Symmetry: C2
Subunit: 99 residues, 2 copies
């Protein structure tokens, strides 16, 4: 799709059989979702850092559908003030900013 920026660019995502929403955030390096579970192995990762780091769980090679488009990539599960799709998945979408 072509998404204008008059509103926050919130899209529907499907991940691990869970239907959720998330913000397409070009100011985020990584994807962070709070309200899901994922199976199998993970690795600890520290995010944030201003006033302290937050420990989250890094899940690799995760199949995720974003606004109807299926991709694979890294998903961090842990606290976040909003679900965020970061550049790591937007590059898998082929997503560009255009003006």
């Amino acid at each position: 799709p072509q998404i204008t920026l008059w509103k926050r660019p919130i899209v529907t995502i499907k991940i691990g059989g869970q239907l959720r929403e998330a913000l397409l955030d070009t100011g985020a390096d990584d994807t962070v979702l709070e309200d899901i579970d994922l199976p199998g192995r993970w690795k600890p990762k520290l995010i944030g850092g201003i006033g302290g780091f937050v420990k989250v769980r890094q899940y690799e090679q995760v199949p995720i559908e974003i606004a109807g488009h299926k991709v694979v990539g890294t998903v961090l599960i842990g606290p976040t003030p909003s679900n965020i799709i970061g550049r790591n998945l937007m590059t898998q979408l082929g997503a560009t900013l255009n003006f």
Copy 2:
């Protein structure tokens, strides 16, 4: 331009005769720049809020050039971990996310 998302989408800006850089941030409602001065009247604005709000100065109807494209809009001046171009100016650019 067409900007891919393999790196942070940092662009050159020109504002009030000052050449600077800033991140095109679709996860930001507003534009916030730290390292500039602007002339004339402003209004106080509170931003942030998690752990407390930060007071900044809102400047209205500011002419700003973003990656060579001249627009007009609101600019907040005050502390920010990085200079940010938010959706308020990206709508003035006609900027879309496309995939």
